[PDB]
Amino acid sequence: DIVLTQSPAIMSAAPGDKVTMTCSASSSVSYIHWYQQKSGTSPKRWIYDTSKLTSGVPVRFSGSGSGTSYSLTINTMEAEDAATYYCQQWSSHPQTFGGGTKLEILRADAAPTVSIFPPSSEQLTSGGASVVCFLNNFYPKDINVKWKIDGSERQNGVLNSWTDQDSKDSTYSMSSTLTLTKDEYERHNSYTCEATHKTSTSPIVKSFNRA
Amino acid sequence: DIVLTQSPAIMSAAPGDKVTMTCSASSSVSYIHWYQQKSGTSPKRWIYDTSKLTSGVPVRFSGSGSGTSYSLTINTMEAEDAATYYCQQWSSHPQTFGGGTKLEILRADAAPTVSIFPPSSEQLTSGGASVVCFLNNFYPKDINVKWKIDGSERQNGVLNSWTDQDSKDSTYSMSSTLTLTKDEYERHNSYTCEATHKTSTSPIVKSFNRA
Amino acid sequence: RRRQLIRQLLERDKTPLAILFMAAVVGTLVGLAAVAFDKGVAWLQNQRMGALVHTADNYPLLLTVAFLCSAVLAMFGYFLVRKYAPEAGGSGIPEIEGALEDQRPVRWWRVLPVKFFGGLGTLGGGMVLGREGPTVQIGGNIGRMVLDIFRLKGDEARHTLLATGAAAGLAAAFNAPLAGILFIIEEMRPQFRYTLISIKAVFIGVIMSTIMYRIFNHEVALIDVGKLSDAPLNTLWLYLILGIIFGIFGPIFNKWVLGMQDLLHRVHGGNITKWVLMGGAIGGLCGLLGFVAPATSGGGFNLIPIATAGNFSMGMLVFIFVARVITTLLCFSSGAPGGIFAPMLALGTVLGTAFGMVAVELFPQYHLEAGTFAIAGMGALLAASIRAPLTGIILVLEMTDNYQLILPMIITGLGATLLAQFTGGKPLLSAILARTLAKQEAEQ
Amino acid sequence: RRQLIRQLLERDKTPLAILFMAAVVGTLVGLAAVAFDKGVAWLQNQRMGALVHTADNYPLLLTVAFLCSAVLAMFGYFLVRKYAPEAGGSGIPEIEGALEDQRPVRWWRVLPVKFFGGLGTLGGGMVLGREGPTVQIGGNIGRMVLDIFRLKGDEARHTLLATGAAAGLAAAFNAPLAGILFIIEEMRPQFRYTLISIKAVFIGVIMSTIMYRIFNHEVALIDVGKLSDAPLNTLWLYLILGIIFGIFGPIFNKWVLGMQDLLHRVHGGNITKWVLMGGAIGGLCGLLGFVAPATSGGGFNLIPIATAGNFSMGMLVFIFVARVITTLLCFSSGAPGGIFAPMLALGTVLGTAFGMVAVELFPQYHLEAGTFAIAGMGALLAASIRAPLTGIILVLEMTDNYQLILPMIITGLGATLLAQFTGGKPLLSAILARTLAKQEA
Amino acid sequence: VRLLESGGGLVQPGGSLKLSCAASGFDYSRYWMSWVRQAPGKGLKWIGEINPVSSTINYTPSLKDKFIISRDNAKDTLYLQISKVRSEDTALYYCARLYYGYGYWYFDVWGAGTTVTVSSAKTTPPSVYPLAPGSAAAAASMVTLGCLVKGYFPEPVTVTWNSGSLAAGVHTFPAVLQAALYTLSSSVTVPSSSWPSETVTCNVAHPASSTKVDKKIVPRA
């Protein structure tokens, strides 16, 4: 079964740029198609028959090629052009799809906007205690976090969850919970929240105290 | 709006008879149609474009004419043709139909089948009385029914209904109803129902008593 | 010299009203007459039906009555022709071609009744031959006849009427007005010299004959294949290959129909009896198969929708095919009265369905429907054998109502004419007329 | 007869070399039409984008609308008056001449003149159809290949020139059938026998259509949908329709011819007054192309809307008289461009109105205005150019309502019959006769 | 095929209602629909027709907005809106798909009807009483049961035995009026060894109040 291989698994570009991904078939194929998927949206057909543009699609778009190698090209990329683009081929049954190419808008740097949160009191009449810590609107995506109970460094109860590129500012986000038994939580006072990220050599910290 | 007016407005024959009916109209109509309304059913396309039989409308049927008078013919009727047949035009506009040629069968004789029914206990829990008398499958259709309360004649609180000629066997039937209170039905005992009819000189009498 | 042209162009299309009014007459007569010939053949197969109902029990008895009736209706027609008009044997199409060349006699006092009753016999019997043959030849003689009976004089009326006659007879035979008009101009008219035939008359006739066949046969088609799927551009090559297949085989088929006319004539030496007998034998074998493999016998029109919906196993199609090459020859080569169009539609539809079936699984990516290759191949023998694509394409189109297949159809068609010309095939009509005109001057 | 046998045995054996050349004429006429067509589009397109820039002041936009139409007009009117005066008009009768060997196939001059001449007039939004251009172009594309390969003898010289015209008629309406039919019906030498291979006309007509398909598929030129049918007792109404068309067909011929004379006086033959009046005429269109978009244009746009019946009864009469005006002006002033396309629009409208009157004079008939539209569509095509067969197979392939084939044939033959008896003449052969007569005048 | 109308019944003198026919078994497009009424025990009269594309709408010589025949091609449904209702408009109304042979236009296939009853009255569901062979229960080879269906409103009700698995041997008598109420009876006849040994149930159905009632007929022991 024909395997299409996408070019850049993931890639970023500044808004205003010539952008080019690549379908690289395992054998020969002809007239491939391209599809666009925004987060949690259902795929749209973008380019069909190697270069015909799905009526609707901006004119900056344009793919082509043939033989074993094809390519989609944005001519001056934009806001709305962050997506995932899949090439599909049906030149030979059964038809198949690419690894996908992840097109992420590149922008200015940004600081984590760190906020620590004490376990709800609803949660405490229940014996669980989760201390959340959002680390908001940053660029690039690569962030690190380290918990601390009374200066002592922690790792267990720690579940971490990045978001993807915000549509209205191109920053990432990242919540991180530390969960613990209830007393496991009372038997300590300080709960700190350090966050190491490209725009500052020493961490950004933030904490609270039970008492 | 042409007025079509139908011949023998009721007409009666023996199976084996060549029956013919008639539709005459106020102006010239042409290519008129004919619907068959068997009893308590919706009508049915029977002959169209004046002289064309619908599908599986037996060969025995036909129709014809021109101008202002047309005529349906059942060449050898059968007992199953019992119906009320309508003619109709849309030669002009509005289209309009006849009034009826309600055809009735004549068959050999056939005597009632009597049954009588005690006011069902739950009709009594409401406080009514219904003494019920079926007279099934009799021909001719003239039937005299008499009620006796303790050998003694009753007339008031008495209603009667007739079925139409049967489509297949040609008989009729008759349901006579007698109604009182929990009162009246408790105070007597001889409940009788009585049937003179062409096929016996002596009443077919039927009854019961509460005990 | 040009000076003449200017005078003619100012004169063009002004056919004398009297020749027009007579086209409208030949029309209505050829019209009604087809409807007659048509309602006739029906009743006769129907009776043969009701007669197999009566012998419901006893099996070999059934096969017998099925054989005999058809043998009996066959003979009656074989005789009727070998006796009172030996020109009404075969299609009767090339005979009308000859007549337009003035090379054949339009003996209508003999042919009108001989062909009409001769066919009713062979068809009513359920032999493998089409209504066209009868209805076209009849149509021509309906023309000639109203021409003589009104003593209209001069080359034009004698050609026009004789042509609007044949046309109306072919339109009434497939409910196909356009296929009619087209048949004359593509195929009937003198192929090498100019002729004086009013096209606006052929039209009047072909309308009148169609309104007659409408008046009586409306609200059911002869073929109903419904709205099939489309042909994407990257599909087209496959109907060219279909067209090559048809085109190599078209002449092989002509070589067979002709060889069988000879190989059949050996069995009776021209003798009016051995003939009418062999005829009962062939028409007998039909009434049998009319009932043991009802696909192998008959006109064809019944199996077209069934083969096109794809409802036949792949073997069944090969079987029907070989079996129908055999039955179609025997019938047409033995020179019983009756056309060869109808059975060629059937023959092509089968080879079309089969090609489409193979294609349907050889190319799952194409999203094929064997059905379309049926409707391509339906007119394809009509092009590799009779060699008259345009006519057959307007035909197939008017019966199957699938205008969105017009591209594949033309290709398959042209493919076939092209490949039959390079494998040296000839127009099967004009080939017969040629054996006939040559065997006429072969007694000097 | 001795000879007939010899020829029957030889029939339909067109020389391979003639076939293979039809194949190339085809592909070339094909692509060419696609070009001319993508062309005209772009031009009207730009004239729109330029009406959006002037979106505010009104008489300014009226002017710009008049202006570039007038400007694209002259461009073409000039282009023709200078370098090839035979490319004026339809261009069709010129090819009939050519097949009779009575005009010259001056392809070195016409190919470019007609192509750019049309793009001008049509891009401008004048009341003329793409066939004229595309048929004549097609023939010249035929002649040319034939020269360029020095194929010798009467057959190739006719065959190619015919397959060329055909293929460009096909590509002009996406109508393969209408194409082959146009040749045998109306184009060929009507009075002497000719040696045109029909098996080649086909090859070209295919290749032409495949080109047009490769680029223009997934949208029809006309989409009327599947309309209702015709009960037998309704046919007489299409005969009445055919008689209206047939008496009026000749009236319209007399106006097209008379307007060519009454317009010739306005310039005396003068290459400048002519080009000027042309910009005036073509300027008038670009104005109405935007003030009553029904009055202007090729026609193909209002066929759908009239057939769905979505026009008030007045609006129809208006559109109709307004069209007999704009249609004449354009075609009679000898602008490069066909007269088929706008006769389709004309018939479709007369048809719709007859249908509309019929719709309420006969409530019992359960009529659809629509169907007399689709019978009238090819009706002028038979009352005027007086070649029904071609025009019927045409309307058929465009409107795909094969169940109207009976009313259509009747309204058609009705018209040809009624033009013949009120002394009308084939409007093409009429033109070629003026021309061939004005030659040795 | 099958057209199957609904929404009939009770209406105030003066107001109005919406009748609806649900088509099933044919390309309901392509087809002109139509309404025809049957006056209580009387003649067939045309109300109106609507064409496929809701674009022609001829009615009968009637008034202002007596009738509004609309359709709904996507739901497969015809519609009728009798407004301003007096008792002429009491009837059995029919839907019907029109056609032709020679284009002289007929009524191809008829609905089943629903009855519109114009009265100030009120809806009474039917009381259903089982009628059984009494004390005198002197059984012969065949045996006549039945149910009294009493005091309901308006017409109709419909009545079948063992859910229409008893077609044979059944009678249902025309209902009769009685000061703003309705009473009919049904009677079925069965082999005497087939009951009480086995089950017999009448199925009474008054759609005017969407009320069904299933009376098993019990021996009077």
Added chain:
Amino acid sequence: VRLLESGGGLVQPGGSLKLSCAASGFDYSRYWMSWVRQAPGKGLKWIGEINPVSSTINYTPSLKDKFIISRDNAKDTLYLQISKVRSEDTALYYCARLYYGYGYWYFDVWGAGTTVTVSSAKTTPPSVYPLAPGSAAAAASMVTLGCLVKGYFPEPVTVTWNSGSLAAGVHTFPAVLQAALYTLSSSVTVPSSSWPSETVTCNVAHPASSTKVDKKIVPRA
């Protein structure tokens, strides 16, 4: 045109379900229909396709009787039955109408999908947890808030903020799976002049556990 696929959810491993895709707005015949699936993060792989009249049905090279595609032309629906569900079948499923230009076929119009979770894990509602900032409520420029909807199964929760009219600057997080339980967090940032002044709610629903809760974020006393 619209394609609406329903009927996803939580299946036990080894059992099976029947996804349905409901289609309006286009002539549902003429067209091939085809299912395609996406394992959360991961390719698109094609399940199969069905023609317009059910005579051709092709599937992906996969176990003998793993998938049953069918289509009900009259109800305008396409189905897909998956049987013996192992967990690789845990994905989102889309239907799609097929077309082509030159006839190298593409997937014309897709629908929203529905999610299929294959697990033995039980349906569990979530708990909602107001998150009001530090003991020291550091009120500066823009104040940051949130809730914890923790300890439910399976996806999805949907969390909006003040009936969804706090749209800009809200931050919903991917959920996480841990010990057969899901957890996510939302954060809304507002003008420090808004809160604690005018009222700020987080709306969580987990429709799976028939749970509707509106947790009012308030400042910690």
